[PDB]
Every structure is written in structure tokens, then in C-alpha cells.
Amino acid sequence: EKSKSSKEQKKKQKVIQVKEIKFRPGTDEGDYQVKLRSLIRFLEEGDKAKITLRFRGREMAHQQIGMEVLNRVKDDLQELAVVESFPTKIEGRQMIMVLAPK
Amino acid sequence: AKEDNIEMQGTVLETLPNTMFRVELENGHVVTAHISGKMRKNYIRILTGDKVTVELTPYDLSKGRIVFRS
RNA sequence: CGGCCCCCUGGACGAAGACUGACGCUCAGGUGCGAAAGCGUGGGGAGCAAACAGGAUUAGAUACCCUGGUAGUCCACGCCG
RNA sequence: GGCCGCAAGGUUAAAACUCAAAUGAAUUGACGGGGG
Ligand SMILES: [K+]
Ligand SMILES: [K+]
Ligand SMILES: [K+]
Ligand SMILES: [K+]
Ligand SMILES: [Mg+2]
Ligand SMILES: [Mg+2]
Ligand SMILES: [Mg+2]
Ligand SMILES: [Mg+2]
Ligand SMILES: [Mg+2]
């Protein structure tokens, strides 16, 4: 009978979810700082963060520009997060980094 | 009958609003450049990190016209 | 401004006369009244509900949706205009 | 700046500067996660 009760006590642990943030190669300081505050919030709540970076048209020519954004994010969330899947190449027209808490 | 324009080469450092760009030249000087009428009529997009030909004038060495994107 | 009843009280309209004899019309300044929210001091508090808390949706969602919920919404007196 | 208000604010009310428009109604299309 019930035990539902016990399930609720088990439930007050945790479930981890993946929160996707998407940058671009040219993204200005103010707009970067907004997206950083989103990531800080997610990670301090104990959630994974799939940081994407997309390219259009001939932005793919200058791949190095995009890479530095992902490097900047990583170094700003170094104390809060660990890296889980730092990208190598442009798969599609995208690069995907995955961070995780602590 | 017009005075001659010296052409230099340079890299796009930054995109500014409405077809304006900061461009570092080979000499080391940064200039604010605008797209030519030919390039905008024929839809030649310029991006950050592109290499460009900059028509300069002696009257102002802080301004230029981007006339080619390689 | 909307249940029903009593008490106090303002205006409008009609019918026939009688009475006053232009006593009128408009109004800068002035004076009063003035939805809701809001403010002050006391009350009251069912329902509802800014803020807020949690659950979701989402690329994100400081929202829309869900479960709650304080001021407030109500009363007296004053303010606000 | 004045007056008013406990406060929130209200009221009276400019100029420099910048542009060659801004606007009202109606007409023909196209479009609508409007209808038939
Ligand atoms: K209550
Ligand atoms: K004033
Ligand atoms: K004017
Ligand atoms: K139609
Ligand atoms: Mg009466
Ligand atoms: Mg009220
Ligand atoms: Mg009150
Ligand atoms: Mg409620
Ligand atoms: Mg609600």
C-alpha cells in the first residue's frame, strides 16, 4: 500500500538534463556575457551543457575564429565545469562541445 | 584626369555596421574601409579574416575602399 | 449605478392653470466632483491574484501552461487627480 | 524654473540638433497559423 511515499523520498535526489546553448563565430561581448550567465546557472544547478557553434556559407573558411569562442567559454567555466567532448573538426556546419558540472 | 590611388593589401579584423570594416594593412596601419559599388552590386560578401585589396587616398590615411576580396 | 426592505435626500418629465417680469447665455483665473492602480493610519480576509516559490515547454523561456501564493482586491477616515 | 503631493508622481512647458518627409482616407495586387 502506497510506497509511492518512498518513491517521492527517492525522487528528491536528482535527474541530470542537457541544456543546449548555441554560439556563432561573430558574437559580440554583451551577447556572449548573456549566454555565459545561462551556462553558469545550468552548471550550478547540476545539469550538462551542450555548447554548439554553427557556421554559415564562407564562415567555414575561417574555422580558427569559431574554435577560439569554444576555448574562451571553456576557460571561463574552467572552475565550475569539466570538459567531456571538446571538438576536432566541423561535423556538418557545426562544432559541439559538451561540459559537465564540477 | 584624376589623381592616382595607391592600392595596398590587408586582412579584415572586424565587421562594423552597414558594409564597414576594420582592416589591418601590410604596413601595420589599421583603416576603416567600405565596400565598393561593384562588389555590393554583384553580392560579393566580406567576412572577418578575409584578405582584401584596399584603395587608399593621400588625403586621409585612416580610410579606404575595399575593391577586391581574394 | 443592479437581490429584497426601511429611513434621510438630489434631478427629470407630463397636464391644466396661476404667479414673478429679462431675473438670461458663456466663462480666463477660482472652486468642487472624478474609473482602476497606488500611498498613510487602523480593521478584515472566503474566492481571486502582481511579486515570489516549485513543476513543465523550449535552441533559450527571467513568459504563455500547471500546483501553490504575499501585497492588493473588501471596510473606516485621509491623500493621489 | 514655478505650483501641488508623504511618496509614486501630476500640472504648466521650451531649445539646440536631425530628417525631407511624417500623416489621413480610399484603389489595384500580393500575403494571413482569417472565413466560405
Ligand atoms: K491570503
Ligand atoms: K517640474
Ligand atoms: K524641426
Ligand atoms: K485571401
Ligand atoms: Mg427622491
Ligand atoms: Mg482602488
Ligand atoms: Mg490600503
Ligand atoms: Mg491561484
Ligand atoms: Mg497562476
Which nucleotide's C1' sits nearest to the alpha carbon of A45? C54
CA distances from B63 to B7, B13, B51, B68 (A): 12, 15, 17, 16
Cell of B66: 575595399
Report the separation in Å between the CA atom of B9 and the middle of ligand 1, taken as the mean of its atom positions.
73
Residue A67 to residue A53: CA distance in whole angstroms: 9
Q: What is the resolution of this structure in A?
A: 2.0
Q: Give the dihedral sign, CA B45/A31/A56/B31.
A: positive
Residue B69 to residue B51: CA distance in whole angstroms: 6
Residue B23 to residue B12: CA distance in whole angstroms: 5
Residue A48 to residue B45: CA distance in whole angstroms: 37
Q: Decide if A19 contacts A50 (C-beta within 8 A).
A: yes
Q: Give the dihedral sign, CA B48/B49/B55/B57.
A: positive
Residue A9 to residue B23: CA distance in whole angstroms: 62
- Sheet holding A94-101: strands in order across? A18-23, A48-54, A94-101, A81-83
Count the neighbouring beta carbons within 10 Å of the beta carbon of residue B40.
13
- Single-letter amino acid code for the residue at A74: K
Residues 6 or more apart in contact with residue B2 via CB below 8 angstroms:
none
CA distances from A87 to A73, B13, B62 (A): 13, 25, 40
Burial (CB count <10 Å: 0-12, 13-18, 19+), residue B6: exposed
- Per the CB < 8 Å rule, is A58 touching B48? no
Q: Give the dihedral sign, CA A6/A8/A12/A16.
A: positive
- Per the CB < 8 Å rule, is B49 touching A62? yes
Q: Decide if B4 contacts B55 (C-beta within 8 A).
A: no
Helix (H) or strand (E) holding A68: helix A63-76
Question: Nearest by CB to A26, which of B45, B48, B50?
Answer: B48
Q: Which of A74, A68, A75, A67 is nearest to A94 (CA)?
A: A67
